[PDB]
Write a protein that holds these residues in place. Sequence first.
Motif, PDB file in Angstrom:
ATOM      1  N   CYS A  12      50.276  34.992 -10.574  1.00  0.00           N
ATOM      2  CA  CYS A  12      48.923  34.464 -10.762  1.00  0.00           C
ATOM      3  C   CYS A  12      48.962  33.218 -11.643  1.00  0.00           C
ATOM      4  CB  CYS A  12      48.009  35.526 -11.382  1.00  0.00           C
ATOM      5  SG  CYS A  12      46.232  35.074 -11.423  1.00  0.00           S
ATOM      6  N   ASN A  13      49.612  32.167 -11.149  1.00  0.00           N
ATOM      7  CA  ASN A  13      49.771  30.913 -11.885  1.00  0.00           C
ATOM      8  C   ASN A  13      49.542  29.730 -10.978  1.00  0.00           C
ATOM      9  OD1 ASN A  13      50.961  31.747 -14.644  1.00  0.00           O
ATOM     10  ND2 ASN A  13      52.211  32.874 -13.156  1.00  0.00           N
ATOM     11  N   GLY A  14      49.090  28.617 -11.541  1.00  0.00           N
ATOM     12  CA  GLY A  14      48.892  27.419 -10.751  1.00  0.00           C
ATOM     13  C   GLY A  14      47.577  26.718 -11.019  1.00  0.00           C
ATOM     14  N   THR A  15      47.669  25.398 -11.101  1.00  0.00           N
ATOM     15  CA  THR A  15      46.533  24.493 -11.109  1.00  0.00           C
ATOM     16  C   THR A  15      46.869  23.419 -10.079  1.00  0.00           C
ATOM     17  OG1 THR A  15      47.433  23.037 -12.817  1.00  0.00           O
ATOM     18  CG2 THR A  15      46.063  24.902 -13.567  1.00  0.00           C
ATOM     19  N   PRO A  44      49.761  31.628  -5.092  1.00  0.00           N
ATOM     20  CA  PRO A  44      48.514  32.376  -4.942  1.00  0.00           C
ATOM     21  C   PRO A  44      47.826  32.008  -3.647  1.00  0.00           C
ATOM     22  CG  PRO A  44      48.698  31.505  -7.153  1.00  0.00           C
ATOM     23  CD  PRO A  44      49.793  30.863  -6.349  1.00  0.00           C
ATOM     24  N   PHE A  47      46.357  28.484  -2.956  1.00  0.00           N
ATOM     25  CA  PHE A  47      47.273  27.350  -2.872  1.00  0.00           C
ATOM     26  C   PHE A  47      48.183  27.415  -1.642  1.00  0.00           C
ATOM     27  CE2 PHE A  47      46.486  27.264  -7.553  1.00  0.00           C
ATOM     28  CZ  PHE A  47      45.915  26.008  -7.585  1.00  0.00           C
TER      29      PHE A  47
ATOM     30  N   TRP B  71      40.400  37.987 -10.718  1.00  0.00           N
ATOM     31  CA  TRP B  71      41.073  38.924 -11.607  1.00  0.00           C
ATOM     32  C   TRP B  71      40.221  39.213 -12.876  1.00  0.00           C
ATOM     33  CZ3 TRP B  71      43.753  42.890 -11.813  1.00  0.00           C
ATOM     34  CH2 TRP B  71      44.604  43.228 -12.878  1.00  0.00           C
ATOM     35  N   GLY B  75      45.104  34.582 -16.183  1.00  0.00           N
ATOM     36  CA  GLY B  75      46.202  34.666 -15.231  1.00  0.00           C
ATOM     37  C   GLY B  75      47.559  34.890 -15.877  1.00  0.00           C
ATOM     38  N   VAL B  82      44.001  36.415  -8.207  1.00  0.00           N
ATOM     39  CA  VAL B  82      43.526  35.040  -8.370  1.00  0.00           C
ATOM     40  C   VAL B  82      42.621  34.994  -9.585  1.00  0.00           C
ATOM     41  CG1 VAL B  82      42.108  33.198  -7.386  1.00  0.00           C
ATOM     42  CG2 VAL B  82      43.657  34.539  -5.906  1.00  0.00           C
ATOM     43  N   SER B  83      42.955  34.147 -10.559  1.00  0.00           N
ATOM     44  CA  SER B  83      42.225  34.165 -11.815  1.00  0.00           C
ATOM     45  C   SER B  83      40.973  33.312 -11.750  1.00  0.00           C
ATOM     46  CB  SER B  83      43.104  33.673 -12.963  1.00  0.00           C
ATOM     47  OG  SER B  83      43.417  32.308 -12.756  1.00  0.00           O
ATOM     48  N   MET B  86      41.719  29.696 -12.364  1.00  0.00           N
ATOM     49  CA  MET B  86      42.313  29.102 -11.175  1.00  0.00           C
ATOM     50  C   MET B  86      41.213  28.642 -10.215  1.00  0.00           C
ATOM     51  SD  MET B  86      45.165  30.795  -8.647  1.00  0.00           S
ATOM     52  CE  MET B  86      46.335  31.021  -9.991  1.00  0.00           C
TER      53      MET B  86
END
Lengths: 249, 254
Positions: A12-15, A44, A47, B71, B75, B82-83, B86
């Motif tokens: 659960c990471n990413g921008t 995720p 993305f 979520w 995150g 999915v946070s 995000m």
Amino acid sequence: GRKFFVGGNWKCNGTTDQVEKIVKTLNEGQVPPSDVVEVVVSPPYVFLPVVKSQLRQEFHVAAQNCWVKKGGAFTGEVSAEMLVNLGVPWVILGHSERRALLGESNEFVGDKVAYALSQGLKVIACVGETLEQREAGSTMDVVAAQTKAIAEKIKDWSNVVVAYEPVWAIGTGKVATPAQAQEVHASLRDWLKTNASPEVAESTRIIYGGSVTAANCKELAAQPDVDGFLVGGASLKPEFIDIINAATV
Amino acid sequence: GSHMGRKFFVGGNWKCNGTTDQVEKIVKTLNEGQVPPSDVVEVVVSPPYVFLPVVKSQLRQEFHVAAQNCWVKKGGAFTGEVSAEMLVNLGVPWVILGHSERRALLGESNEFVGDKVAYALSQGLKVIACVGETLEQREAGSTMDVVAAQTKAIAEKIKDWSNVVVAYEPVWAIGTGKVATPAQAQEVHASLRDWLKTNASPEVAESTRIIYGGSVTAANCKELAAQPDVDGFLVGGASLKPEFIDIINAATVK
């Protein structure tokens, strides 16, 4: 025999900017050819479109989960046929975080794997025991039960990769060593030989899903029953390129 | 009687449906649709996660997108989730939380949903918070006991209700063979607003949109809209169809 397999689980990471940078690094990375290593990256859900459209064609994308059956009235879920329609070829199922924090049972995971396969996805199926289970002497009992719940529901392993997660080394005082990884991988492969078939045991990739870094990837890759990695945190880093190159070991 | 009127709100929950070409068609139909202006109606559409990018990029300016879930916290090591932050980063302004399908099939508890709502708001998301009782609960006389418990779990975790829309789902009339009348919807919506009056504040009760998340069609949307405590809809299946345009136009009933 078995083609080395490296999966990167972004969790659960990413921008949008970070994803831009990661894809750039992946695309510019110097790695072995596709007949030497099979590389799969797992962003995720949100993305998956931008990564799938920008990512080098040797590397393929995976969803981090999918629903247990046909789509419809399941708010918040993403179905296997939806992913297949989108052109996503892989999915991670039964990750320890979902088993632990979202209550996914052995049976639930087994049903997900079977359904995903039926729709045309390739599956990274995760198994692994906790510290409590390991210290109780239940490592193979637990891993066998997890794997059996999947085996009972499928009859084609050609598009399955099994990932072993040493959950007992997460947040504890313990480090999972390459020797310890090999011991479980060999035991798991023997389970597959006895319970699926010798052919399935010989051809099925069993990848290691513990902590993988540039520092330890080569020693891990050298273990005879370790067929690759399901990488966690380092999958977000340039280090992932170094890890892929452990395939030549 | 100090508060400005509540703006009519129409959300479309696509649920776990969608293909590339179907989603293209749906958005084109929305874009070509004749609807009231944005000062009369607020429209939100909620595709599956994987279609949020393409829908956001093609959908007309006046309409905005929602995720169907997020979520419960920041995150990190939460494979498959999915946070909120995000979604904010992606430019998704809304999220649906506590949908009856997630409460029942994914076992989301009252407190879990309440924590999700508080965290989503904290990151700047606007929230469609879903509540509602089953047939068994309704026949047990527990409609407001259940809805109060669900709503309390949210209320005890937040102060500002400004960016919350509450969706009442008559789960008792969803897949059971029962139907709900607009009169029955009005009754629950009024009771829920009265609960807010006492347990949050009269100002929160007056300002908060309470939308109906039972079966809405072109054929019943105007009568539902006419109900004084029904501020709009959370539409299911019809949200995939051109019929959704007709439903949006029920805003003019107010």
